[PDB]
Amino acid sequence: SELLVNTKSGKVMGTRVPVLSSHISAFLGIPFAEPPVGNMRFRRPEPKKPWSGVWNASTYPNNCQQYVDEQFPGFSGSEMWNPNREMSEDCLYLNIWVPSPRPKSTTVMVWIYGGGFYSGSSTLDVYNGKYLAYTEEVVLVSLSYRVGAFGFLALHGSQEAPGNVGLLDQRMALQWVHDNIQFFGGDPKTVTIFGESAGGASVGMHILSPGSRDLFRRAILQSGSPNCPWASVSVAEGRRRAVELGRNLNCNLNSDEELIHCLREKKPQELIDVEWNVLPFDSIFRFSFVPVIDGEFFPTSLESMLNSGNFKKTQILLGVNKDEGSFFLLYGAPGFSKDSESKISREDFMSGVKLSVPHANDLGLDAVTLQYTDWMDDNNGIKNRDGLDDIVGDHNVICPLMHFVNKYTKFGNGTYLYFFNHRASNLVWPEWMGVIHGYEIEFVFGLPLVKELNYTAEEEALSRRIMHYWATFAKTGNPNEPHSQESKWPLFTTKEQKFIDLNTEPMKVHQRLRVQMCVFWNQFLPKLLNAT
Amino acid sequence: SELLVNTKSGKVMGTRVPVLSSHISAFLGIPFAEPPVGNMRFRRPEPKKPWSGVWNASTYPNNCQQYVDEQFPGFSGSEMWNPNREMSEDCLYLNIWVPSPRPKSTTVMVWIYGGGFYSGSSTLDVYNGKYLAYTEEVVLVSLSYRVGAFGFLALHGSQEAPGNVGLLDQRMALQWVHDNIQFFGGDPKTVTIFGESAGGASVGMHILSPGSRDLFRRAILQSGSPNCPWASVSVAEGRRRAVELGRNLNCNLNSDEELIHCLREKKPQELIDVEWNVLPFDSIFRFSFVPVIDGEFFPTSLESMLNSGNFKKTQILLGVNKDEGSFFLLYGAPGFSKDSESKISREDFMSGVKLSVPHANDLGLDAVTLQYTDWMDDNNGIKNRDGLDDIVGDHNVICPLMHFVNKYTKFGNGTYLYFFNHRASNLVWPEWMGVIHGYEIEFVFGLPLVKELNYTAEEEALSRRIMHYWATFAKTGNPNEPSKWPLFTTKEQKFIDLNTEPMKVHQRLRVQMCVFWNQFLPKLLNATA
Numbered sequence A: 001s002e003l004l005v006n007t008k009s010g011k012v013m014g015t016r017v018p019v020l021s022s023h024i025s026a027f028l029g030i031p032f033a034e035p036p037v038g039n040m041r042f043r044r045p046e047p048k049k050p051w052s053g054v055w056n057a058s059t060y061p062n063n064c065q066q067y068v069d070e071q072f073p074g075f076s077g078s079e080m081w082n083p084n085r086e087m088s089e090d091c092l093y094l095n096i097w098v099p100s101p102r103p104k105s106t107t108v109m110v111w112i113y114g115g116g117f118y119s120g121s122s123t124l125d126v127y128n129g130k131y132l133a134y135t136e137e138v139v140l141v142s143l144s145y146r147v148g149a150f151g152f153l154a155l156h157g158s159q160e161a162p163g164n165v166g167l168l169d170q171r172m173a174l175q176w177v178h179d180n181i182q183f184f185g186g187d188p189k190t191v192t193i194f195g196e197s198a199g200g201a202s203v204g205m206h207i208l209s210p211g212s213r214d215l216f217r218r219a220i221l222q223s224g225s226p227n228c229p230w231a232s233v234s235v236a237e238g239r240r241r242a243v244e245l246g247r248n249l250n251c252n253l254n255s256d257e258e259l260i261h262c263l264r265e266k267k268p269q270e271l272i273d274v275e276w277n278v279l280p281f282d283s284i285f286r287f288s289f290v291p292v293i294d295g296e297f298f299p300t301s302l303e304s305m306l307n308s309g310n311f312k313k314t315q316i317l318l319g320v321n322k323d324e325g326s327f328f329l330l331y332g333a334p335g336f337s338k339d340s341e342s343k344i345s346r347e348d349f350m351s352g353v354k355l356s357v358p359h360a361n362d363l364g365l366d367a368v369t370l371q372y373t374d375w376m377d378d379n380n381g382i383k384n385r386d387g388l389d390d391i392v393g394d395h396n397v398i399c400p401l402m403h404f405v406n407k408y409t410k411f412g413n414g415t416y417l418y419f420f421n422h423r424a425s426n427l428v429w430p431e432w433m434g435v436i437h438g439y440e441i442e443f444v445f446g447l448p449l450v451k452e453l454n455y456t457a458e459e460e461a462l463s464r465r466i467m468h469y470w471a472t473f474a475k476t477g478n479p480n481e482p483h484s485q486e487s488k489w490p491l492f493t494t495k496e497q498k499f500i501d502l503n504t505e506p507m508k509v510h511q512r513l514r515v516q517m518c519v520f521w522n523q524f525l526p527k528l529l530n531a532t
Numbered sequence B: 001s002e003l004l005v006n007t008k009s010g011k012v013m014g015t016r017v018p019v020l021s022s023h024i025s026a027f028l029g030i031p032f033a034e035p036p037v038g039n040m041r042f043r044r045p046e047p048k049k050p051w052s053g054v055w056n057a058s059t060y061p062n063n064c065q066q067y068v069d070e071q072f073p074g075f076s077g078s079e080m081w082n083p084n085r086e087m088s089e090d091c092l093y094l095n096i097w098v099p100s101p102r103p104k105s106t107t108v109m110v111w112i113y114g115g116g117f118y119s120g121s122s123t124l125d126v127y128n129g130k131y132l133a134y135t136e137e138v139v140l141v142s143l144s145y146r147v148g149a150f151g152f153l154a155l156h157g158s159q160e161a162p163g164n165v166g167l168l169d170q171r172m173a174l175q176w177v178h179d180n181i182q183f184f185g186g187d188p189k190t191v192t193i194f195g196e197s198a199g200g201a202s203v204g205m206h207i208l209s210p211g212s213r214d215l216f217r218r219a220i221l222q223s224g225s226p227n228c229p230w231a232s233v234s235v236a237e238g239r240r241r242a243v244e245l246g247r248n249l250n251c252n253l254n255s256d257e258e259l260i261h262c263l264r265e266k267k268p269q270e271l272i273d274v275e276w277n278v279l280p281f282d283s284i285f286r287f288s289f290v291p292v293i294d295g296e297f298f299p300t301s302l303e304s305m306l307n308s309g310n311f312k313k314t315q316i317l318l319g320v321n322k323d324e325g326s327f328f329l330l331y332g333a334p335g336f337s338k339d340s341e342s343k344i345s346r347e348d349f350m351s352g353v354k355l356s357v358p359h360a361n362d363l364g365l366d367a368v369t370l371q372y373t374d375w376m377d378d379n380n381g382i383k384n385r386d387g388l389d390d391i392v393g394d395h396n397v398i399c400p401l402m403h404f405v406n407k408y409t410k411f412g413n414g415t416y417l418y419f420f421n422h423r424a425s426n427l428v429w430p431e432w433m434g435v436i437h438g439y440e441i442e443f444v445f446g447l448p449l450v451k452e453l454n455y456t457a458e459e460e461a462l463s464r465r466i467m468h469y470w471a472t473f474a475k476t477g478n479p480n481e482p483s484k485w486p487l488f489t490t491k492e493q494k495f496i497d498l499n500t501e502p503m504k505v506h507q508r509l510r511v512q513m514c515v516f517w518n519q520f521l522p523k524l525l526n527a528t529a
């Protein structure tokens, strides 16, 4: 049978699903690890032990325990990102979409969800893999990993809570794919890992971590990179936050052993209720439990590894959205509202930059302000809003990524860069937010192809070329179909630094994506902050 | 006679001169101090002792001892600023042009030449006062003062070489105008001092100094302000450059008295030959002997005085030129040439900013470089050149002036700001240098009104409205006669362009770059230097 597959861990039974007038096979909620429960919370994952009988893989699994956004109750804009399945610590599962009839040795793409390392689910409607698997005839896998304290509590030295376990969950899902995907018609030698934001940072992390390199062929990073300021913390900072979590829960803080034991006895929701209290400052775009630069998953600092070429040399395709920062200003900065133009007063602009660049000293704050302020027109609320939008996006996503792409390209085997700037026709968010963080995903996954979703014909066309770019890249390491009549996406080279826009208009090639501001964020500001 | 005038120090005989198919009276080279020679070198000026008989005031006086530019021999562009009279330490004189017939109590304008405090003469062709005095019917005076070591060698504590004597020379010429101008038909109660660059900074210094405030009614500052980075030094820095001057000359350095005695034995040229060697850095737009913040001529720091309102409250008219910095890049930065477009490489740009902001640490240089570099086109020689040009002008002239203007307007009684950007059709310098430092002067003095000078008719028109703006301001405290030149205000910050086109009003002259130079860089340097 097409739906019955025997894996190295046991048999599995999938389901036939409809997809754009055709059908495809789906294996949902396949376990790849032992439930990280009880005494295993905070521990490295362990391989799922073989089960006997047939595993029913006809329904989505549970979502990992995570904070749930209740800012706009009933609002689809925010809720599409919340867990749409019951939450449980028993959440290490993966989903697979296989073309029907089953391919022989086809390209595999593994999706890693984002959510700032504190949230995310593999089961969201936007991650529904059937459209891309069907359309580009690839074997699509969506994995899952522990988020929040459950995935990244880090007490360096301890082997009960080392930190980086969510990254290890991802790796185990990758090992599972390397071991069993051939049984689904996938080629373990041609797997592309791709993810957005936290997922994108994750992808870059596996490119960096020796232990992950050999488990995939190449990578796609969307709106995220390993070096993002919010994507990792030092062992010290990580230890401090773990201990602060204990303090907030009245825990015995005498030894890791006791602290951890105390934390293992709490119900998930108790950890989550206090999750945000351990952050260093009042800030936006900062999350409590994230990867730690441990000297293990990451041999040395990310900068030194990037500098020395100490990472997987392959082909990468990556990019950003025009307004990565808007989502975060809306939720944490004064003056922003989803029901108004959100014109920002100079006073709010000032507090906005402090929130946005929490680690900066006064001189640092002044530099950012000067860099993003039009002094001929400083009370212009729109320029103030947009200025703050750019600050959040440039500092958190765009510049860290440009740094990564420039460093990576010195050693890599091909880099393709994009700038996604199409504002969807059916977007429920206010216009000031622009091309929002995460909204290129529905195009990557082919959502615009489903008519009931009411996207424009130009949007369906954009989705199809994006899916083909992504897939062709996954298959060959080049988004372009060699000798083809269509415009060509040029390689990003260290000299020319070319990149293309991704929208409904004919392709435009540009150079040096936001160089000016990124020179400020990547070179000058760090120099000024180091000064003292 | 009309040319024979009795002043409080003695009689003087002027001369009738031609001015645009007409004539006026000119009293050239009137002494206002005792010759600052021999033992008087470095000392405060002394009032000129009365003479008997008639002083011959028919010809220009000597120029003060100064560095002479020989970079471009025979070249009129550079040579027009060089002394055109013999140089002598006996140089403290003033000249006066009086309308004919001699008016009754008329507005007086006193010119203070620039030259970075190390050079300058009152006798240059471009400072010829006859056209302005005639056209605008004002009594025009041009004074002189000691420059270089002779006027600013500062050994604070010593009464032999106190520092600021060049400024005191200027003060005594003003005191002389206060005392005698009424005999030339001038109103001592309506005196306007005006000067360019070091002269403009000088004017600003008299506004600040208690000892000078009551010797003039209003002030005009052209391309210079008191707070300019090159316009003053601390007593400690002035003292070390003095000592270094002696070191360069094999002087006894055991005591101020010995050092000074040694320096007074040296021939003027010996001093001048090593003058530049005392500067603390390889730099441009930096001069060795300048005003010292002594606690006497300047009670306290310039900023504190500006902040507390400790200065003369009156009307000020002031402005800058579009390309203040190019002259200095041409002379001291790699890559520039008078005979080429001077496209500037990246290497030369980096070198250039280091020369322009000598005092900055590396972070400071990075900040400046970032602020003026187009990272989408960093190898554009033209942009690199124009960028360096803006850095020099913004940092040395424009932003310091804007800072002065904003601080002064809080307390002042009327500010008029201009931005001169007309490139003279007959300039001999290359296009890349643009609207050069000092070239608005010829329009202020009315040179475009003389036909054999070959200016265009709209240039003569421009000169006339500038002269009238200047003289009307001098007479009333308002350039406007009842298109209006708006009052610069703390809130609005309006200013006008000065060119051949119809007057346009703008606001916040180079506010973006000036926030950087006036607020951010100083803060950065204070936090990390």
Ligand SMILES: *[C@@H]1O[C@H](CO)[C@@H](O)[C@H](O)[C@H]1NC(C)=O
Pocket (backbone or CB within 6 Å): A056, A058, A059
């Ligand atoms: C697997 O679960 C789905 C829904 O619960 C159900 O329709 C189906 O019959 C199940 N298959 C088996 C063999 O239990």
Ligand SMILES: *[C@@H]1O[C@H](CO)[C@@H](O)[C@H](O)[C@H]1NC(C)=O
Pocket (backbone or CB within 6 Å): A412, A413, A414
């Ligand atoms: C990728 O690698 C092969 C050699 O391993 C080389 O010939 C080719 O030029 C490389 N491609 C790029 C874009 O670096």
Ligand SMILES: *[C@@H]1O[C@H](CO)[C@@H](O)[C@H](O)[C@H]1NC(C)=O
Pocket (backbone or CB within 6 Å): B056, B058, B059
């Ligand atoms: C004034 O001096 C000049 C020469 O320097 C001379 O030609 C002129 O006649 C003199 N006038 C008188 C009255 O001495």
Ligand SMILES: *[C@@H]1O[C@H](CO)[C@@H](O)[C@H](O)[C@H]1NC(C)=O
Pocket (backbone or CB within 6 Å): B412, B413, B414
């Ligand atoms: C100058 O002073 C007079 C009287 O004190 C005052 O009415 C006027 O407003 C002042 N002018 C300005 C522009 O400050």
Ligand SMILES: [Cl-]
Pocket (backbone or CB within 6 Å): A018, A019, A020, A450
């Ligand atoms: Cl469907």
Ligand SMILES: [Cl-]
Pocket (backbone or CB within 6 Å): B018, B019, B020, B021, B450
């Ligand atoms: Cl004439």
